[PDB]
Ligand binder design. Structure first.
Ligand code: HEM
Length: 153
């Protein structure tokens, strides 16, 4: 359970992300795909992209980054009371997209790295710890839904 102070750190940096949702979404997906190429293979939509320059040039990738970060921002702003938001997301990611929980750990690392690069003054160690806690809570609650549906592993 995050404290109120932890949530305030999380949402303070998140409000900075929302100044450039699409740039952050590109940076995060590109970091994910470069750091963990197995993740790119899960996207029929993107798996033709073979270089970082091609990834940066893809408008469709930039659009999907906005989709992802909009969904995540709506979850963070619930401060833990996010059951309604996680149901469809766990269902699609477990049963249609076939995304292991471990790949959610990978994208969480990419999000933290990009926030640290773009917002160092609002993403000191206290805020890094709080965002890690928030992303852990996200993964815990998604993993419980995966387990229900027979996909935790
Ligand atoms: C912060 C974590 C993530 C969030 C908030 C998120 C959110 C979303 C949303 C909102 C959609 C469209 C609606 C839906 O299908 O449910 C989507 C689609 C999808 N996501 Fe995620 N996602 C996350 C992580 C991942 C990861 C780590 C992967 C793969 C390694 C992945 C793979 C996919 C795929 C394959 C689609 C379908 C893309 C298409 O063909 O249109 N997601 N995601």
């Amino acid at each position: 359970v995050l404290s109120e102070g932890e949530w305030q750190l999380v949402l303070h940096v998140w409000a900075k992300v929302e100044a450039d949702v699409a740039g952050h979404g590109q940076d995060i997906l590109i970091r994910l795909f470069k750091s963990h190429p197995e993740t790119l293979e899960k996207f029929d939509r993107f798996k033709h992209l073979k270089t970082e320059a091609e990834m940066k040039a893809s408008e469709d990738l930039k659009k999907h980054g906005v989709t992802v970060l909009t969904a995540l921002g709506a979850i963070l702003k619930k401060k833990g009371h996010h059951e309604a938001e996680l149901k469809p997301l766990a269902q699609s990611h477990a049963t249609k997209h076939k995304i292991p929980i471990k790949y959610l750990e990978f994208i969480s690392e990419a999000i933290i790295h990009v926030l640290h690069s773009r917002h160092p003054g609002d993403f000191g160690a206290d805020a890094q710890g709080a965002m890690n806690k928030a992303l852990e809570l996200f993964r815990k609650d998604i993993a419980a839904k995966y387990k229900e549906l027979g996909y935790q592993g």
